[PDB]
Every structure is written in structure tokens, then in C-alpha cells.
Homo-oligomer: 345 residues x 4
């Protein structure tokens, strides 16, 4: 069985040959149809030995879809060959958060060493993969696998981030999206679907701002030092109802604070080591909340899939063979994938 | 009338004419002194509203759709009344007030530490009935502000949740009571002073623990691993904020309510739990001030005052700075 | 001035000549640019004498848009010439509900004799009108007065009824809109602008079904006894929400027959004595039911914002003041394709 | 093992020796307590035509127990647990939020609750289908724990649905100070600042209501509507939770509710319905019939029980006393909940 795995700290990932797994009881085995590349995957492989805590080796890929190959003893509700998507942020299933589907915010996960596929558990970047538990499988009917893998993260996360504050984004509101990459271009679209918000996109790259318009953005602003003024220029004196920073570097967060509205929100979603928002009197408008959200909930994934199934999310992808796995990650690193990269086994 | 004023930046306070409507005018029955005034009066000429300035943003009074003689309370953060926020009574978050130059009484408009006062518009008065005005004055801010901050994340504080209250001061101690009125949350109080901790218990707290280095651990030892659903920090110093960050739960909330120039929560990955939101809330909303008055009228709020005469004004202030008033401080005309 | 008025119980409205009024202190006078005919008005004029409570004569029109012509003493906030829409459900201004802008749910209006323009207070079907207080005007800017007047009732009410349960209409949800006329056709577009909901519309009339399709419905089906099974056909076993802008027993019955578990019915349309039957074994578990009234201050602000954004496409027919009475007859007969709007 | 089943339509339940059951996936509990819900004195009144739950049926949908297992772990042997009644599919949109009481796939997949189409809790032992249907109760007294699964959960959910309305100044009306209603009163007080007015038919129930925190107490029947308005001023209750559900309690609820208020019809009277239409109910006042409660809502009730925020009035009975206990419930003589201890 072929797979892409991280094997040495600071080394590139490699194509490997390792056993097809079999499902224990309660487990499901998928024949992987599509596996998404997330930029988080990079942030991991950039960890130094001291910080890295995910086991070696690790089959990569926390964006995952496939078909049911083989059931472990006593699993019901699923038939061999039903098409499914994998809910990534696995949790204990039993705590107060888990009971509401919010397994991303599971209070027990850490203690019980429950880790997401691709992030401590064997990932989706192989021909087959195991899902621990049936409730982490979401039905996707005839949905194209290539366009669906991304929904599990590039979809789920922005959706979550938005769902946190969706009551604010009524008519008149303005939402700002910073970074039109994997999560970014999907962000915009989610915002058109479930809100009346005017959407303003922000990227460093001119072609990415075109992709932004392409997928629904009302206006498109060039990133950097002119950004905040251009945004206010667009929002009138008032500012942006919310800011979804899918970059999360210090400059984009600075821009976020410089633009957000009184009683608004900033979602620091993108990860830059040691970048923070500065929330104190005089540094931010009154009542403007700031959060770093994580992935997304059970019911939220089914909502994202519902969005795809309704033809409301036009996902941008590029396909790679398994052997082009390592190559796909040099491409995401250099920034040359216009959307999400996806590895079709 | 007499009217405790602030006429030279960096000093200490004081006899003005008596103003006229044509608008509403109230015989003041009480005036709260907020720590915010001490913040306003350590403001360099630069940073710093107008002088002369009649003090007091916490005001109740009696009128000197409203009966002459009505006992009423003054909604503080005035705004345009006409934006999206103001239409929802959320005038504390009004977008146009700055640009229209609309300032609260005792904060750019003539305040409550006079004997009579003007209130610009009829909507800024909340009927208090036969509630004792001394006890009511605080409601308007020491009640309003923490009520509003507790109102922003109320649905997270169902049974089994935990709320931490940092700074059992004028505001702190009303907040503790609020949490007990409107939630089933476990309340944990924190403070530097051992007498303030006792205050905390008297008004309902489920535990009160010493502020400092041992605070984070002591809090976690009562919450278990999870931490605290909501931290409301009424001190807002960097040390209190650091504590809050170290105890909050995943999917929790931090409300930075106290003001220390240059203190901030640092919100970013590794420095705060996932899903833990932070906000600096400001003052409160119209319907919120009614809700506060409703709690008082039901006997659900036991407000600790200490009365002052129109004259004892300036002395009343130095005691606040000194940390020597147990609860609020109220000036009566 | 020229105005249309209900002058005699059970008679038709007539065009009359009455003095142009003048703002009291606190008040605004408007030069009316547009006035909306609402079916509620017909309901009102159908009332028998005993029920009828709004005084005589009464100047019709509870949907109104104009420009500021005269400020009463003490009124700031507005400049003469400003374009404004009239918030209708006037309230006391001070009560717990009013302070949140929900003057439609004011608890003191009844007691105080505070009634809406055209529904106890002289309406907007005249050359000029009086609005009692400045908070009841909402700026419209350059918005076409003809497509703006319906926002005051025909937008505001659907917007509200939808607001009450919006967290229900996530991706995957379905909403039914029964009755694609004045409110109905606007209710469709709102659902599409502010929710991911799939939208099925329902009407007796085949032209109206097209209108629904034309303004965004994902589907459109014929009202009547066959209507439920066809809605169910579209959904599978049902409908997350039903907004019934007809509110007749037959439609309500359909409504209950198709609402999802933990869904909702908004009974918006008014048929005298028609009611939902909410009780065990007659409605799914969790399915809530409410008769909403009008909408809220911020709500109207928000509806106005939707128009300005170009997300609401309002279908209208224009009438002079004299065609007033003739336009009401057209409404009763059902020959207006959208909202009838009078331009003084 | 001994158990108390309904075996003959129209006939009182009976006590029987049947085999102790075995776990599949499943989990077996030594029932430490089994609550009696007036809902059963409904199911048994069902005519042979509408009754659809199978014969014979171990009665009892409020269970609390001690844990053998199924091949499924996460719970240890002898852990104390409460049982989530309204079983669902665990896979639909409602079930992913934990809202199994609103599971859509349950009637198709023919999934029924214990005591309600599946084997009950009124026995020495019981089967539980899946883990997620077990709630840790820790060291709580099982007699007081059992009513929480239903007499607790049902009112908590009914209240949860509209809690935001119930701020300081709000008024809540509880009709029917019985099993559900007297926990209803206490929940209202723990999680809100609403002023509680209880209504019942009999003085001793009105006593019970004050005993559990009711701000005020009303004699039910015609005079109620007026008596309630005398206490709300001419404004009426923000909320009315009707644990009785008869046309008259419902009627009363319409005549007292506030503009933009809520009526929750929780009691089951066969044919009784609210009449939601213009001129018959205030603008903006919502009605619903809610069903049981959610997984996270049961963790929330347990938490309330655990912090001494609830006092659950019960009378104990043994396995043999069961049948006679229902007669009690029917004639309405139990002060709170009847609970069974094997
Ligand atoms: N919060 C979560 O639960 C979670 C989940 C998934 C991803 N993430 C993080 O979100 C980030 C985005 O992920 P992705 O997979 O979409 O990466 P990506 O490579 O697809 O995104 C790159 C995009 O961001 C733009 N960009 C880079 N720097 C910018 C700048 N300073 N200003 C404006 N735009 C800039 C790029 O030009 C490009 O359009 C990553 O850091 C990832 O780790 C977090
Ligand atoms: N956010 C707003 O819109 C707004 C409105 C009003 C007041 N405030 C602010 O809230 C803060 C408190 O207000 P107050 O008037 O009740 O003050 P107060 O002086 O009456 O209360 C101070 C309390 O805090 C305690 N304290 C000081 N430092 C502490 C620390 N390190 N750890 C624990 N306890 C500590 C003191 O022992 C005392 O009990 C002030 O900074 C004030 O400006 C903010
Ligand atoms: N709830 C409120 O506060 C509020 C506010 C404004 C208007 N209304 C009421 O709402 C209702 C709608 O008013 P409008 O002005 O939009 O009416 P309208 O005359 O403009 O629209 C009538 C539409 O309903 C359709 N219709 C009639 N019977 C039908 C049936 N059995 N099935 C499907 N469609 C049917 C007609 O075909 C027509 O398209 C009226 O009853 C009006 O009085 C209520
Ligand atoms: N909605 C749900 O999912 C659900 C769940 C559980 C129970 N229930 C139903 O709720 C109801 C109450 O259950 P219970 O076991 O607590 O009943 P109970 O017998 O334990 O209590 C009944 C109480 O209501 C009082 N009462 C009777 N008629 C009255 C009236 N006219 N006005 C005021 N009070 C009156 C009685 O005196 C008694 O105090 C039942 O109908 C039951 O089936 C519904
Ligand atoms: Zn990722
Ligand atoms: Zn968990
Ligand atoms: Zn203050
Ligand atoms: Zn404003
Ligand atoms: Zn109307
Ligand atoms: Zn009012
Ligand atoms: Zn029951
Ligand atoms: Zn289900």
C-alpha cells in the first residue's frame, strides 16, 4: 500500500510502501478517493524536533474522503462503497462538548491521546485509511471526491469561524477575508451563501485577488500598508463588521484591528508562530471580540457538504498522483497552487 | 447649586448657576463616584473633555410620558439614537456619537455631582419607582457594566459552567451577584485584599482566592483540568490578564473590563486555548439598564454603598484612589 | 390636499380634500413620494361596525415613503429634503420592548391610544403626512420611492417573520412560502439573500407561481389539497420552516401537514377566525407556531440595506391619487402583480 | 430477574419472572432506581387500535443504574449512570447536535426508547443500546437521580428553548405541580431570574410549589387567568409552561401570555390543542409541543442535581409494589415522583 509520510525532522516527506491496515471493532476502512493538502501540514513539518509531537513516521493528510472498503466487527449504518468524508478533529465522543458535536473543542482529547488523522493518527494520503469511529463519517452521495476532500478543512474551518458570529453578518454588514488560498477562496463563498454580507478580499498576490472576484468577492484589496485605509475607504468611517484573517501574521492582525468595527469580531484563523492580537483598551474598538477558532463541529461539516451538494461552493483544486505527493508540498510551500491541492490515490 | 468640579488638569475638585430645560431637569437624589474619574484625572493635559466639568456619570434623581416627581435613573453612554446600534438601544456602541460630539454626563457633558442636572433626551431615563436612590445610583454603571459584560456570553454559563470574577471592587461585587441571579454557574472570586474576599462570599461567591502568583494554580485546582468557562477581569492589569489567559477553558471567554493603560490580552495560537474569545466591553445597553433595575427591585442585588454629602466630594475621591471604600461611594445633594 | 379615505363603514374609499397638516413640536411633515396598498387595508374596510376601531374618516396607507418638508420644533437629525421611509408599528418608545426597537411588541401602545399611520392615525395615502417622532423615519438615500414604500410593510413583515427563526435555515434547510403576492414575493428574495435555505413557493395562481420562480424560488407548486404531498415529494420526510402569507385554514392545515420535526410555522396572513391547531399528534414535536406582527426598527434598517445592495427586486404597479379607490378594487380582485403603489 | 410489564390492552400492568437479558455493543445495568411517569398512565389508557408499542413491555422510561459491558469500553464495571431516554440514530443532523429527541431517522429505522417500545427500567437489570446513551452521575443518590432523566430533562428542555426571554423582569408560569412541574419550578430559579407563579388544582400541590421556590401560587380553573394577571399587572406572563396540557390549562395559557411571549404545551391530553391565530393569541407569542430533551441537556440537569440546585420529592416502592404505585399516580396521590428500587 502506497502512502506519503513524514519520516525525518526537517526532511521532505517521502513516498513509502507500508501495510494495508484492517479495521478493529468499531473502525471503518476507506479506499481513499481524494486527499487534500493543507498549509497546516507544512507548519508541522517545519516544527523542530523539540516541539514536534506527532509520531514518526506519520502518514499525512487531514483532509480526507473515500469509500467504505471494509467494516470492523459490529459497525452499522454504513454499506461497503457508500461515499464519505472524514470529520477530522476527533474527540472523546462523551464530554459536554462532544455531545453537541463540538469534538474540536473536546475537553478530554489531549488526556486520552486522541489525535486527528494526519496529525498523530495515520492520515489520508495513502490508498486506504482507517477511521476510528462511524460518527466521524459524513455521507457525500454522488459528490465529486476531488472537490469534496477540501470541504473537510478548507471548508469546515472557515464555516466554523463564520458560524461563531453569523448573527452579526446581517444586511449592511461587511466581512473581510485575508488570504485567498485553500481556506480563503472557500471562505468568501460561504459568506455569500449563508449571509447578506458585503465581502472584501485581501491578498498579497494580484492573481489571488482575481480568484477572489472569481468566487464571489464584492471588492478586492491589495495587502500591505495601504490595506487598512483602503478597507475603511470602502466601509465608510464605520469599519468592517468582521475580519477573517486566514493568514494570521502580525501585519494582517494589525490590519485587522485597524479596520474592525465597534462591537465587531476578528477571527485569527491562520497560524504564524508567536503572532497575536492585542486586545486592550485603546488598542481595539470597544466590544470587538477576537478568537482563534479550531477546525469545526459535526453538524457544521454536514452543513458544508449540504452547501457543496446544493452547488453553492465552487472549490478550486489541482490533482496530483501519490508519487507527486512530495512535489505537491514543494508547490504549496512556494505558493503556486491556485486553490487547494488534492492527491487522488 | 453646589457642584463638585475638576477645573485644572492634575489637581483636586470644588458653586455654579442652576441650569434650565427646553430636554429634562432632575433634582439629584444620588451620585456614584466611579474609579474611571480617577483614571480621567490622572490624564495629562494632552490625552485629556472641557473644563469646567461637573462630575458624576452614575446619577439618579427626581423630575424637577413622564410625571413631574418621578424617581428615575440616568442611562450613561448617550448616542445618536438613530444608527443601527442605537435603534437596538445599544447606544454604548453608537457609531455616530464621536463625530456628532455626543458625550456622557460627567464625561463631556454636565454631570451628576450637582444638586440639579440636565438630561438631553427622554429615552435616557429609566423609571426606578420607590427604589432607594443611594442604592440605585451605582446600578447605572457598577451594575450596568458588568451586567452587559455577563450578557455578551450568558448562554455559555449553563449548569456545570464556572465563572471567575477578578477584582471584587465596586463593580466586582455587583457582578458576583448578577451571575448568581441569571446563571447556574459556579462563581470564583479573586482579589489582592483579604477583606474583599470575604465581601465576595457574603454576596454569594462559591470560592474566593488570593490574587497573585498562586492564583492560576489555585483556580485550576478547583476547576480541574478544564479551567474556567468565563473570566471577567474587573482590574484589567497585565498580571490579571495573564492569570485569565492561564485559566480559561477551551471555547471559553475573557472579558477585560478594568482599565490599565497599555494592558492587553495576547490572542494567538499557543498563547490562549482554542475557541477562547476576548473582548473589552464598554458600559451597557438601554434594555440592559432596565434589566439591572429589575434585579434591584426584586431584592436580587445587595449594593454596598458608603454615603457622602455634597461637601465631602473631594475627600470621597482620595479614599477611592486609596482602596478604602468597601463597595461603591455615593454622593447625596 | 388630496387624500384617500375610508369615510363610511362598508363603503368604498373616496378621494377627498382636507387641510394639509403642520408638524407639532417633535413631529415631521413629509411630502409623500410613494404609498403602498396592503391587503390588510381591505381586511380593515371589511370589518363590521362593531369591530372597526380606527376612527372615521381615516386616511389610508400604512406603507409610506417621502421627503422631509417641515421639521417641528426641536427636531434635529434631519435636513429638509431628506428621503425617508416610515416605520409603521409606532410604540411608546420607553418600555422594555421599545428600547430594543421592537415597537411592534410595545406593551403600552394599546393603553396610550398609539396607533399606526393609516391604522388609527392619518396615513400616507395623501400629498403630505405627519410622523409623530423622528425615530420613526429611516433614511433611504437615492432609492427609488416606488420600490421603497413596500419595504415598510411587505419587506419588514416577511423579514421579521424570517428573523424569528433564522438560525433554523442553515444549508440543507427548506423554507415554504405560501402566498406569492405583495409580501410573498419579497419574502422569497429575503430568504435567498440571508439564508442558504432551499425555497418552495405556493399559490392558487399560475402567474404567481411564475413570479415566484422569477424572483428566486427553487420550486413552485399549486396550492390546495394536493399541495402537501407535492411539497413532501420535494423534501423527503419535511419543511424546516413554513411562512404562510395567506393564513387561511386550508393553508395552515397544509402548513402543519408539511413542517419538519423541530421546525416552525409563521402564520402571517389573516383569515378571521382561522388558526393553527398546536397539540400532540396534530403537529410534529418541536415545531413552533407564531402569528408575528409587522417588524422592528433595526429590522426595517436592514430591509432598506438589502434594497440598496440590489438584493431585493420589488414588483410594482403605479397609481395616481385619483386611481386610489380603483387600485383597492384591483387589489381585492387579485389583479395586481406585486404591490400597488400610489404616487401623489 | 423480576420486572413489571403491561401485557393486556385495557388491563393493569403485572409483575413477572423473565430471563435476565444479555449485552450485544450494548451495556447491562443493575437498575438502582426506576421512575414512574404519568406518561405511562397514558400509554396504558391507549385503546388496542392506536397502541403501537408491543406486548409484553417492561415499563419505565426513567432509569438509573450500575454498569456487564457489550465489545465496547470507556465505562468501568459498576460505574453509576443515568440513561438518556429518547434514543436516536446518532448520525442525522439533529443527532449530531445530540438532539436525539428530534432524530428524523428513528421512526423509519424503527428505533424506540426503553419502556416505550423497547425493554424498560422497571426490572432488576436492563439493556442500553449504545454508550453515548449513558450519563455519569457519580455518587448521586439514585432515587433522586431517576426522575432527572425525564421529570428533569423534559422541563429543562422546554425551558431551554426560550430561556433568553426569561431575564430579570420576566415572569414564568408553571401549570401542574406534579412530577415534571416541581422540577420545572426549581430549574426556572437556578438558570434564570424569572418570577415563578405556579398553578395547580389542589392546595397541597400549591404548598409543594412554594416549598420548591415558587414566588406565588394559584388555584387552577376559571379564576386562574384573572389571578395571574393581578400579579403580572396587565402585561401577562413572559412564559407559560403547561405540564398538564388539557384544553382548560391551555386555554388559560392563551389568556395570560405576553405579547412576544411563549406557551410550551408539555402535558398530554388527547385532543387538546392551542389555537394559534389572530385575535386568539397576542402578536409574537410562540407555541410549541416539545418532546423530552437533548444529550447535553441531560448533562446539564445532572450538573444542577450535583450542585444541590434541585430537590426531588419522591416516594419509594419495591418491584412488587409497582402496579399499585401506578394506581396511586392515576388517582394522583404521590407527592412528586414515585420511584422503584430493586
Ligand atoms: N484555525 C484552524 O483550525 C486551521 C485550520 C486549517 C488551516 N489553518 C491555517 O490557516 C492558514 C491558511 O491555510 P491554507 O491551507 O489556505 O494556506 P494557503 O497557502 O492556501 O494560503 C495562502 C494564501 O494566503 C495568502 N497570503 C500569504 N501571506 C499573505 C499576506 N501577508 N497578506 C495577504 N495574503 C497572504 C497567499 O498569497 C495565498 O493566497 C495556514 O496557516 C493554516 O495553517 C488553521
Ligand atoms: N469597561 C468599562 O466600560 C468600565 C466602566 C466602569 C468601570 N470600569 C473599570 O473597572 C475597574 C474596577 O472598577 P471599580 O470602580 O469597581 O474599582 P474599585 O476600586 O471599586 O475596586 C477595586 C477592587 O479591585 C481590587 N484589585 C486591585 N488590583 C487587583 C489585582 N491585582 N488582583 C485582584 N484584585 C485587585 C481591589 O482590592 C478592590 O477590591 C476600574 O479600572 C474601572 O475603570 C470600566
Ligand atoms: N402578519 C402581519 O403583521 C401582516 C403584515 C402585512 C400584511 N399581512 C397579511 O398577510 C396577508 C398577505 O397580504 P398581501 O398584501 O401580501 O396579500 P396580496 O393580495 O398582495 O397577495 C395575495 C396572494 O396570496 C395568494 N393566495 C390567496 N389564497 C391562496 C391560497 N389558498 N394558497 C396559496 N396562495 C394564495 C394569491 O394568489 C396572491 O398571489 C394578508 O392576509 C394581509 O392582511 C400581515
Ligand atoms: N412533552 C413530553 O416529552 C413529556 C414528557 C414527560 C411527561 N409528559 C407529560 O406531562 C404531564 C405531567 O406528567 P407528570 O408525571 O408530572 O404528571 P403528575 O401526575 O406527576 O402531575 C400532575 C399534576 O398536575 C396537576 N393537575 C391536574 N389537572 C390540573 C389542572 N386542571 N390544572 C392545574 N393542575 C392540574 C395534578 O394535581 C398534579 O399535581 C403528563 O401528561 C405527561 O405524560 C410529557
Ligand atoms: Zn488544515
Ligand atoms: Zn469529548
Ligand atoms: Zn464608570
Ligand atoms: Zn447611534
Ligand atoms: Zn400591512
Ligand atoms: Zn413601548
Ligand atoms: Zn415521561
Ligand atoms: Zn438521528
Amino acid at each position: 500500500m502506497k502512502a506519503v509520510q513524514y519520516t525525518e525532522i526537517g526532511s521532505e516527506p517521502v513516498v513509502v510502501d507500508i501495510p494495508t491496515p484492517t479495521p478493529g471493532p468499531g473502525e471503518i476502512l476507506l479506499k481513499v478517493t481524494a486527499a487534500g493538502l493543507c498549509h497546516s501540514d507544512i507548519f508541522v513539518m517545519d516544527m523542530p524536533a523539540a516541539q514536534y509531537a506527532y509520531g514518526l513516521p506519520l502518514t499525512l493528510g487531514h483532509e480526507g474522503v473515500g469509500t467504505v472498503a471494509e467494516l470492523g466487527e459490529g459497525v452499522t449504518g454504513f454499506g461497503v462503497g457508500d461515499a464519505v468524508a472524514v470529520y477530522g478533529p476527533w474527540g472523546c465522543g462523551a464530554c459536554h462538548a462532544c455531545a453537541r458535536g463540538r469534538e474540536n473543542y473536546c475537553t478530554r482529547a489531549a488526556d486520552l491521546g486522541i489525535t486527528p488523522p494526519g496529525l498523530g493518527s495515520p492520515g489520508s494520503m495513502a490508498e486506504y485509511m482507517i477511521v476510528d469511529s462511524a460518527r466521524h463519517l459524513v455521507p457525500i452521495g454522488d459528490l465529486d471526491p476531488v472537490a469534496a476532500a477540501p470541504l473537510t478543512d478548507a471548508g469546515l474551518t472557515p464555516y466554523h469561524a463564520i458560524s461563531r458570529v453569523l448573527p452579526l453578518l446581517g444586511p449592511g454588514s461587511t466581512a473581510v477575508v485575508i488570504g485567498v488560498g485553500g481556506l480563503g477562496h472557500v471562505g468568501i463563498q460561504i459568506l455569500r451563501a449563508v449571509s447578506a454580507a458585503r465581502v472584501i478580499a485581501v491578498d498579497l498576490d494580484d492573481d489571488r485577488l482575481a480568484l477572489a472576484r472569481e468566487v464571489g468577492a464584492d471588492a478586492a484589496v491589495k495587502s500591505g500598508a495601504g490595506a487598512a485605509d483602503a478597507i475603511r475607504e470602502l466601509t465608510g468611517g464605520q469599519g468592517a463588521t468582521a475580519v477573517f484573517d486566514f493568514v494570521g501574521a502580525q501585519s494582517t492582525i494589525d490590519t485587522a484591528q485597524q479596520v474592525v468595527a465597534v462591537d465587531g469580531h476578528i477571527s485569527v484563523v491562520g497560524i504564524h508562530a508567536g503572532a497575536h492580537a492585542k486586545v486592550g483598551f485603546f488598542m481595539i474598538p470597544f466590544g470587538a471580540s477576537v478568537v482563534t477558532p479550531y477546525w469545526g463541529t459535526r453538524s457544521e461539516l454536514m452543513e458544508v457538504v449540504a452547501l457543496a451538494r446544493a452547488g453553492r461552493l465552487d472549490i478550486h483544486t489541482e490533482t496530483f498522483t501519490l508519487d507527486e505527493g512530495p512535489a505537491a508540498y514543494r508547490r504549496l510551500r512556494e505558493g503556486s497552487i491556485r486553490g487547494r491541492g488534492v492527491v487522488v490515490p
